[PDB]
Amino acid sequence: AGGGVALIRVASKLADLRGQNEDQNVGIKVALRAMEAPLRQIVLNCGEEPSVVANTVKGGDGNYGYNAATEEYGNMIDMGILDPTKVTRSALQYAASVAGLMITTECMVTDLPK
Amino acid sequence: AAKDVKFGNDARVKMLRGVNVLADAVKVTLGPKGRNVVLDKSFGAPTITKDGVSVAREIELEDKFENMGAQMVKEVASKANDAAGDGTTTATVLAQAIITEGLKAVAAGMNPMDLKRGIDKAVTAAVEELKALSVPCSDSKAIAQVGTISANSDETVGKLIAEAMDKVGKEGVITVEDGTGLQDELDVVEGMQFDRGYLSPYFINKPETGAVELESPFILLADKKISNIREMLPVLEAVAKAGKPLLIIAEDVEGEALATLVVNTMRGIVKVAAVKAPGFGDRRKAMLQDIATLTGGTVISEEIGMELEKATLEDLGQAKRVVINKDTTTIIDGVGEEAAIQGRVAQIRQQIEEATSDYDREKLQERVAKLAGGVAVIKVGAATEVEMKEKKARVEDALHATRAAVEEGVVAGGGVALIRVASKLADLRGQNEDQNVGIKVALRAMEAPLRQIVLNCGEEPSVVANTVKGGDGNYGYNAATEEYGNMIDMGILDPTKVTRSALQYAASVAGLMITTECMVTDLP
Numbered sequence: 245a246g247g248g249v250a251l252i253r254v255a256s257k258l259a260d261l262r263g264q265n266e267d268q269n270v271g272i273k274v275a276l277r278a279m280e281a282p283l284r285q286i287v288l289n290c291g292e293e294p295s296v297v298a299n300t301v302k303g304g305d306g307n308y309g310y311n312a313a314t315e316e317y318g319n320m321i322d323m324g325i326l327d328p329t330k331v332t333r334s335a336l337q338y339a340a341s342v343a344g345l346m347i348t349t350e351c352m353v354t355d356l357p358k
Numbered sequence: 359a360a361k362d363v364k365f366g367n368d369a370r371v372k373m374l375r376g377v378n379v380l381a382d383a384v385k386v387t388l389g390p391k392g393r394n395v396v397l398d399k400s401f402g403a404p405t406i407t408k409d410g411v412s413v414a415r416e417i418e419l420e421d422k423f424e425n426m427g428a429q430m431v432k433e434v435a436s437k438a439n440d441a442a443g444d445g446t447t448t449a450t451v452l453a454q455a456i457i458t459e460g461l462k463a464v465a466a467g468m469n470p471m472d473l474k475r476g477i478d479k480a481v482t483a484a485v486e487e488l489k490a491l492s493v494p495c496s497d498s499k500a501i502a503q504v505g506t507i508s509a510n511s512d513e514t515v516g517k518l519i520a521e522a523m524d525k526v527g528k529e530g531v532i533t534v535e536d537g538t539g540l541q542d543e544l545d546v547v548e549g550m551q552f553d554r555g556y557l558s559p560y561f562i563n564k565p566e567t568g569a570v571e572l573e574s575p576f577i578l579l580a581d582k583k584i585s586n587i588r589e590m591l592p593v594l595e596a597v598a599k600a601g602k603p604l605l606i607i608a609e610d611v612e613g614e615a616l617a618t619l620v621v622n623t624m625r626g627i628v629k630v631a632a633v634k635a636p637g638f639g640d641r642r643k644a645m646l647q648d649i650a651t652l653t654g655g656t657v658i659s660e661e662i663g664m665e666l667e668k669a670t671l672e673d674l675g676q677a678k679r680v681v682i683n684k685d686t687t688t689i690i691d692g693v694g695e696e697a698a699i700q701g702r703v704a705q706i707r708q709q710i711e712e713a714t715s716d717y718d719r720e721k722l723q724e725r726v727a728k729l730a731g732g733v734a735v736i737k738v739g740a741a742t743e744v745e746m747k748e749k750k751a752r753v754e755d756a757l758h759a760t761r762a763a764v765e766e767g768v769v770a771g772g773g774v775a776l777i778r779v780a781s782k783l784a785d786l787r788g789q790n791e792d793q794n795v796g797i798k799v800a801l802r803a804m805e806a807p808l809r810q811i812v813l814n815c816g817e818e819p820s821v822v823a824n825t826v827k828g829g830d831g832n833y834g835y836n837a838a839t840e841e842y843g844n845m846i847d848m849g850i851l852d853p854t855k856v857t858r859s860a861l862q863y864a865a866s867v868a869g870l871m872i873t874t875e876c877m878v879t880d881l882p
């Protein structure tokens with residue numbers, strides 16, 4: 245399902261995940277909180293309130309979601325709003341990769357501003 | 359000096375910016391999950407406080423138009439603190455909401471005065487609805503709940519205040535002072551006490567406690583300065599024949615008379631103790647008259663036409679026990695016909711009603727407590743001084759809230775009552791469309807306190823607001839436990855007076871701030 249609701253589905257599924265350390269728990273909460281960013285930004289660009297729509301979508305199940313073009317809810321499959329699984333998986337994995345690279349970076353070397 | 363003059367929207371945006379600075383500093387302390395603000399003091403250490411008016415009274419800005427905005431919105435918190443003693447953060451939140459919405463409506467081409475009239479009409483209707491929505495708060499459990507909620511969910515404070523209010527009575531007074539230990543303690547005084555000790559340590563007959571104890575004495579109330587013993591001979595001889603102790607409450611006793619008294623006390627002739635008359639001036643006269651009424655005696659004064667030499671036993675009062683320490687004198691179980699006490703306290707109530715300053719009113723209330731009720735003192739215990747100050751401020755907030763809740767009743771707390779009122783006033787209309795817009799502005803601003811409480815918890819204010827608006831009755835949101843339920847059943851109570859006062863003062867200041875067009879101030 246499109247519109248950013250698949251990531252909300254998985255984030256709501258994974259709310260029970262725990263880590264071995266209080267720092268690994270902060271990392272797990274950081275990654276799960278970032279899966280709602282697409283739908284929230286879509287609703288923000290359309291002009292509604294992201295929190296109410298996100299709560300309504302999380303409350304639903306399956307392919308329930310929000311149509312941004314007509315500003316109504318419904319089954320995302322029936323409204324014809326789809327994403328291939330490869331697109332979502334690739335975007336999530338590459339975002340996590342670059343975030344991990346930037347988190348463990350100790351030095352940056354560049355030419356002088358001259 | 360020379361001035362700077364700004365017109366229209368420039369003035370309004372500067373003013374709103376100053377309002378926003380002060381409101382953003384104040385609003386971080388609202389609810390069970392608000393935080394503390396550190397205030398720098400020029401003389402001393404910083405103070406860490408969660409009180410709205412304390413934070414508001416410190417804010418001053420470098421820019422002059424923004425400073426005007428902040429100085430104007432500061433009066434809401436000041437006035438709410440003066441009137442109710444609590445509810446200043448809510449008043450500031452409401453004022454900021456009204457100002458923001460009203461400026462948005464003004465920028466759309468509305469007439470500011472009609473918006474102000476609509477806001478006034480909505481607030482009047484809202485106050486009537488709040489009065490209709492209230493319920494009495496008389497049992498001790500509800501008073502404990504109010505004191506607990508006002509002290510930032512501290513059960514011990516609520517229990518202590520409920521016990522104090524139960525013991526001291528409806529006519530008594532309760533004060534808060536610094537303690538010496540780590541635990542809060544309550545000391546209640548029954549009877550009349552004034553802060554005057556004996557004039558000579560030799561009067562002490564019980565060195566174990568260093569206190570002068572007299573059983574069934576006479577009280578000689580001398581409204582004059584006594585230096586020569588020649589005046590007291592008749593009454594002293596009469597009391598010596600009587601065979602029971604005597605107490606002198608006089609303006610002062612000089613060396614000769616005091617020396618004669620101390621010589622006689624140790625010889626076993628008479629049991630005499632002498633203390634000073636409390637107060638200075640007219641209040642001293644009034645309290646001597648009060649002691650005369652309580653003890654059933656007559657004040658010996660020159661201004662009425664009697665002399666102390668002609669005094670007899672009929673002019674001397676009586677008591678059951680008198681205990682005098684280095685600092686305080688207490689008179690216990692004094693003989694007096696009740697009608698005199700009720701009459702005196704009645705008169706004192708009439709000059710209570712005809713009093714302007716709060717100092718005079720509190721002195722009169724202390725007098726009424728001494729004559730009829732009691733006086734309770736609560737000591738606050740804390741390890742350091744900053745902690746002591748923060749806890750003492752919380753205890754004072756709780757005491758004020760319990761007083762208000764007793765005198766007017768309680769409504770459901772957490773911002774729910776304002777939402778219920780605004781839901782009830784959904785069909786109110788004015789004379790023209792600008793007035794209807796102003797009514798809508800007020801009704802929308804009535805939901806700001808709950809939204810800020812939910813923000814301070816890290817939740818979503820709009821989801822909770824919608825869920826609470828969808829319910830009926832006392833249905834609300836518990837921000838401490840993060841659950842929905844009955845506001846009354848879980849003990850989240852707010853006095854009606856605090857809510858009404860916050861709404862009134864916020865509307866009064868914000869309606870005027872909406873109608874600005876020009877601002878004149880000094881130059882940088």
Ligand SMILES: Nc1ncnc2c1ncn2[C@@H]1O[C@H](COP(=O)(O)OP(=O)(O)O)[C@@H](O)[C@H]1O
Binds near residue numbers: 247311313325327
């Ligand atoms: N009518 C719609 N309602 C809600 N979401 C939509 C709709 N149409 C497309 N989307 C979502 O918007 C996203 C498209 O954003 P886009 O600007 O194409 O960014 P990207 O290039 O990263 O895909 C897709 O994830 C799609 O699921």
Ligand SMILES: Nc1ncnc2c1ncn2[C@@H]1O[C@H](COP(=O)(O)OP(=O)(O)O)[C@@H](O)[C@H]1O
Binds near residue numbers: 390446447771836837
């Ligand atoms: N557990 C709770 N759940 C929801 N609301 C609460 C709770 N405890 C207190 N409140 C509300 O929070 C407000 C307390 O804010 P406070 O910091 O006392 O500011 P004020 O100076 O306006 O009283 C009260 O209106 C009260 O109704």
Ligand SMILES: [K+]
Binds near residue numbers: 387409447
């Ligand atoms: K506060």
Ligand SMILES: [Mg+2]
Binds near residue numbers: 444445508755
């Ligand atoms: Mg309070």
